[PDB]
Design goal:
alpha/beta; 5-stranded mixed sheet; 5-stranded antiparallel sheet; 14 helices; binds the ligand Nc1c(O)cccc1C(=O)NS(=O)(=O)NC[C@H]1O[C@@H](n2cnc3c(N)ncnc32)[C@H](O)[C@@H]1O; biosynthetic protein; adenylation; tilivalline; tilimycin
């Protein structure tokens, strides 16, 4: 069985004490300095009557102190709720309510709403970090709660094992203590665990991006300056790198694209641009962090009809596609993706919604707790998991369902289409496909292209062009912002 996060960290801190752990600006912090500040801060937090099981929110910009407060909290057994410091105060009130946070630690204590949560100044708590008060800390299990995250807000509870599994080397990545990670993902977003905890729990180094919104070249110079070897990117951020500076994507050894569907020809240009291993992967909030990886072997693997696979599970993770009954699907057979293993969350805030998504199923001589993704998926001829839909991306046309995300892939296979979103609209229901291209195309060309790969009733009525498709600051297409933008 796994250990707790502070247990793995202390074992790493005494094994690689002189290796680099954090890099901010030009300053570097070793695992020994990080362990001392974490041990001192953990005793200070206990002297504020923060005990095991308490829910403490975190609102600190990208700083060396941000990750010390994380390691400090888990040590005392608290459950942290990270919130983006760039988020508006309306969203903070929702998250603090949905998480039931009893405390809040911040570097800007005034830009927050009032409520039942106590507000503490991280600028003050660091001042009281004496080298005297040593403290004594609880014994934590792998199933003890670690942090709380949100998803579109649903409140999700993550255990220690969900992020402690990242301390295991991934065979497809070949990571070790020699590597270096770039922390650019939002802390309130589960993809930041791929960067924070795969580094601090393996002896590797974590490069801290500037706070706020650094631009693309600010990240490109940093990947080259601090020699990042493991780069986790979102769909939109990966789209920008290929368009602008694709050469910077082959400085690291592995690049992992995750979070959303992406035009397959972006992977084709990315793999041809160098010899860095490019990955498509599945990340899920309810499975704590990154969950699967598919290595795009070459441009000849990029195919039509179906998008790029998400691959095979990470260590201590199990993923399987079930059909209309609980049994694995064959090749091509479409079903829903179920996930089990050390990454599965402890549940939602609603005990009934928890039971409607977490089910214990016997599988291979063992009762295993599965989470339902509501992602329609299938397999390829090599048992690589391939996503095709998401359940709420459907609609009835001529009495029969159609897959929204499936038509989007058939449209992206057109060489002129850069990207496309499709919207279900209300008429006395039809499809509206907003496309992007750089060369004037006719909407009859896109419809004629669709008829070669789709029946006549899987073709939208309206095609419109958007100078750009909206993003969510987490790198994925915002179908919500597009609909509200189409209300013009
Ligand atoms: N990206 C993450 C990460 O790297 C680490 C940890 C967490 C996340 C995260 O995304 N958590 S989340 O916000 O709850 N979203 C979950 C939903 O995203 C969609 N999704 C995810 N990957 C892909 C992909 N390759 N192709 C197409 N669609 C994808 C599916 O529908 C899925 O069910």
């Amino acid at each position: 069985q796994l250990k707790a996060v502070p247990d793995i960290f202390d074992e790493i801190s005494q094994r690689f004490p002189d290796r680099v752990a954090l890099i901010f600006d030009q300053r570097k912090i070793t695992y020994r300095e990080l362990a001392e500040q974490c041990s001192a801060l953990a005793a200070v937090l206990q002297n504020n009557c923060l005990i095991k099981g308490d829910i403490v929110a975190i609102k600190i910009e990208r700083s060396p102190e941000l990750y010390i407060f994380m390691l400090a909290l888990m040590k005392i057994g608290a459950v942290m709720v990270p919130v983006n410091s760039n988020s508006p105060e309306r969203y903070i009130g929702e998250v603090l309510s949905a998480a039931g946070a009893r405390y809040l630690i911040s570097d800007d204590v005034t830009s927050v709403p009032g409520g039942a949560w106590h507000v503490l100044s991280s600028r003050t708590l660091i001042q009281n970090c004496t080298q005297q008060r040593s403290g004594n800390y609880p014994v934590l299990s792998a199933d003890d709660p670690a942090l709380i995250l949100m998803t579109s807000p649903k409140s999700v509870l993550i255990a220690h094992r969900g992020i402690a599994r990242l301390g295991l080397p991934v065979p497809a990545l070949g990571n070790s203590e020699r590597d270096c990670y770039l922390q650019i993902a939002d802390i309130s977003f589960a993809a930041s665990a791929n960067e924070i905890w795969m580094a601090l729990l393996t002896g590797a180094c974590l490069t801290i991006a500037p706070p706020g919104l650094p631009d693309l070249m600010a990240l490109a110079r940093q990947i080259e300056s601090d020699n990042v070897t493991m780069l986790f990117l979102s769909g939109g951020l990966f789209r920008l790198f290929v368009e602008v500076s694709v050469e910077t994507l082959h400085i690291p050894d592995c690049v992992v694209v995750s979070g959303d569907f992406v035009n397959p020809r972006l992977f084709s240009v990315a793999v041809q641009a160098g010899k860095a291993k490019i990955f498509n992967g599945l990340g899920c909030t309810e499975n704590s962090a990154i969950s699967s990886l598919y290595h795009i072997q070459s441009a000849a693997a990029l195919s039509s009809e179906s998008p790029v696979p998400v691959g095979t599970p990470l260590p201590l993770v199990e993923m399987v596609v079930f059909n209309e009954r609980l049994q694995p699907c064959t090749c091509g057979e479409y079903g829903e993706l179920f996930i089990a293993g050390a990454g599965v969350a402890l549940g939602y805030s609603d005990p009934q919604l928890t039971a409607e998504r977490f089910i214990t199923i016997p599988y291979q001589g063992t009762d295993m707790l599965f989470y339902r993704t509501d992602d329609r998926a299938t397999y390829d001829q090599d048992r690589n998991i391939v996503l095709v839909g998401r359940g709420n991306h459907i609609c009835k046309i001529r009495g029969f369902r159609i897959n929204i995300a499936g038509i989007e892939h058939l449209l992206r296979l057109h060489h002129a289409v850069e990207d496309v979103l499709i919207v279900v609209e209300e008429t006395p229901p039809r499809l509206h496909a907003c496309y992007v291209t750089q060369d004037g195309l006719s909407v009859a060309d896109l419809k004629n292209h669709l008829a070669m790969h789709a029946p006549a009733w899987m073709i939208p009525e309206k095609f419109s062009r958007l100078a750009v498709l909206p993003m969510t600051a987490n790198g994925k297409k915002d179908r919500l912002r597009l609909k509200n933008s189409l209300l013009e």
